[PDB]
Amino acid sequence: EVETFAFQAEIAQLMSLIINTFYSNKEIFLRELISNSSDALDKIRYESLTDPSKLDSGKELHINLIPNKQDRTLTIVDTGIGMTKADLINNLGTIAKSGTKAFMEALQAGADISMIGQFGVGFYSAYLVAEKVTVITKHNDDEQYAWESSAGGSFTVRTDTGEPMGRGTKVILHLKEDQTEYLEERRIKEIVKKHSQFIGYPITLFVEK
Ligand SMILES: Brc1ccc(CN2CCCNCC2)cc1
């Protein structure tokens, strides 16, 4: 049972700008997604300070980067607070409408796409490199859900029958054909060292057969 939703017009505009603007510095997508994971881990850590049972769904707080060249996917896994179904539908827990408004004003006023994270909509930088994005998520207060979009104005939400996650969020980037450098170990290491050196959680880059 799959529910299909329309993006708000402002978010559809944001994604089309990200997909269509000529902008070579695409590597910042990974910084933005790792930053989102760190924010989600901060949230469940804070909640656990007054209620230790919040970590009954998993005590480890970490970020995993999983490249798969056969599937041409890069997956970013975190054990943060996750998202409810309502969060997913509401622009994956962001204030994307007001954030997009501020971002596009800054772009005409000198800014570039790399500053997207300052406007709270860094998730959508995934479409710099991905033709399709799948988000699997589990929040303590809801069931496991799968969000998916290839842009084009719509996204889907369904209950996830796949591998149970415990708690957190999995962002699966189905990479564009010409963006497979982001599956190479040395390229991922370079980006993480350049942009994510002070993230306060272990980042593990998985290797392949
Ligand atoms: Br790939 C990769 C590259 C470098 C690190 C070093 N890290 C920085 C991120 C946060 N943990 C402290 C140490 C990790 C993964």
All domains of the chain in start order, with CATH = 3-205 (3.30.565.10)
Residues 6+ apart with CB under 8 A from 191: 27, 30, 31, 182
Given a contact cutoff of 8 angstroms between Cβ atoms, the answer to whether 87 and 3 are in contact is no
Nearest-angstrom CA–CA distance, 109 and 186 = 35
The preferred substitution site among 31, 76, 187, 197 for testing ligand 1, maximizing ligand atoms within 8 Å of CB, is 197
CA of 71 relative to ligand 1 center, distance in Å: 25
Q: Are strands 63-68 and 203-205 parallel, antiparallel or unpaired?
A: parallel
Q: After which residues is the chain broken (C to N over 2.5 A)?
A: none
Residue position matching structure tokens 């399709």:
132
> What's the one-letter identity of residue 79?
T
Coil, strand or helix at 173:
strand
Residues at the binding site are 36, 78, 97, 123
Of ligand 1's atoms, which has the minimum distance to the CA of residue 199?
10
Nearest ligand 1 atom to the CA of 200 is: 10
- Return binding residues for ATP: 36, 78, 97, 123
H or E, element range at 19: helix 9-20
CB 139 within 8 A of CB 83: yes
The arrangement of strands across the sheet holding 130-138 comes to: 3-6, 154-159, 145-149, 130-138, 168-175, 73-78, 63-68, 203-205
Ligand 1 center to 208 CA (angstroms): 18
For atom 1 of ligand 1, which residue has the closest CA? 189
Which run of H or of E encompasses 185? helix 185-195
- Method of determination is X-ray
* Radius of gyration from C-alpha coordinates of the chain: 16
Name the residue among 205, 199, 202, 206 with its Cα closest to residue 39: 199
Residue 173 pairs in a beta bridge with 74, 133
Binding pocket residue ranges, ligand 1, CB within 6 Å: 188-189, 192-193, 196-197, 199, 202-203, 205
Closest alpha carbon to 126 in 159, 171, 82, 94: 171
CA-closest residue to ligand 1 atom 8: 197
For tokens 């970590």, what's the residue? 55
Ligand 1 pocket, mutate which of 75, 184, 193, 195 (most atoms under 8 A from CB): 193
CB atoms < 10 A from the CB of 200, how many?
9
